């Protein structure tokens, strides 16, 4: 099903903490592409143009640079199924079975809120990140359209402080025209 009005508001960063619920890795099952290559090829330009156009205080090149810093990554594709996450970075691959570790509610400098879903990897000697946090503008069980994933090896607390880089993944089958469409229209 499409989004209830509570889901829409939550996707815009407005929600009541009492409504936040745990979620399972299954909400992210599937094969995912980084959108980074489409920022680079310049196929995301129409998105940043539209955003600039709707706000006279913003510029194209500054919106794009904000998404550049945010999207940049070499993990081009991610696969999730059966409690396992698999990462393809260039020619390297790694995978780990991930355990759920809760969620965390955040309030941003803008006063908008978000929720991260935390996961930890079962091996201390895997190439896969030990800590992974999922943020998708969803605050309760629902299958994800696209996601931002925070990946690190140090601590969950450290990743929670990351605000500038957030590699971003859309379903692998999607074309550039279709990624842009989703970005323009909710
Ligand atoms: Zn998003």
Strand order of the largest sheet: 1-2-3-4-5-6-7-8
**Domains, number:** 1
Number of helices: 6
State which percent range the strand residues make up. Answer: 25-35%
Q: Output the helix-strand order.
A: HEHHHEEEEEEHEH
Percentage of residues in helical conformation: 25-40%
SSE diagram, text form:
Elements: H1 5-11, E1 30-34, H2 36-40, H3 45-53, H4 60-71, E2 75-81, E3 84-89, E4 92-107, E5 113-121, E6 131-135, E7 147-152, H5 156-161, E8 168-171, H6 176-184
Antiparallel strand pairs: 1-2, 1-8, 2-3, 3-4, 4-5, 5-6, 6-7, 7-8
Helix pairs in contact: 3-4
Bound molecules: zinc ion.
The site of zinc ion has 3 residues, from loops.
Q: How would you characterize this protein structure?
A:
The chain is α+β, with helices and mostly antiparallel strands. It has one domain (1-186): Beta Barrel (Lipocalin). Helix content is 26%, strand content 31%. The chain is built from six helices and eight strands, in the order αβαααββββββαβα. It has helices at 5-11, 36-40, 45-53, 60-71, 156-161, 176-184, and strands spanning 30-34, 75-81, 84-89, 92-107, 113-121, 131-135, 147-152, 168-171. It has an eight-stranded antiparallel beta barrel. It is globular and about 50 Å long. Zinc ion (ZN) binds next to loops.
């Amino acid at each position: 099903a499409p989004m209830t009005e509570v889901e829409q508001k939550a996707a815009a960063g407005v929600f009541d903490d009492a409504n936040v619920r745990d979620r399972a890795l299954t909400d992210w099952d599937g094969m995912w592409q980084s959108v980074y290559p489409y920022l680079v090829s310049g196929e995301l330009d129409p998105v940043f143009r539209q955003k600039a156009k709707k706000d006279p205080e913003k510029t194209f090149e500054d919106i794009k640079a904000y998404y550049r810093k945010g999207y940049v990554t070499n993990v081009e594709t991610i696969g999730i199924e059966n409690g396992v996450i698999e990462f393809h970075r260039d020619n390297n691959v790694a995978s780990c079975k991930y355990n759920y570790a809760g969620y965390k509610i955040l309030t941003y400098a803008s006063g908008k809120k978000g929720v991260r879903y935390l996961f930890e990897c079962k091996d201390a000697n895997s190439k896969a990140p030990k800590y992974v946090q999922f943020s998708d503008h969803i605050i309760a069980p629902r299958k994800s359209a696209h996601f931002h994933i925070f990946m690190g090896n140090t601590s969950q607390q450290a990743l929670l402080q990351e605000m500038e880089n957030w590699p971003t993944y859309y379903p692998y089958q999607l074309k550039a025209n279709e990624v842009v469409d989703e970005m323009l229209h909710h």
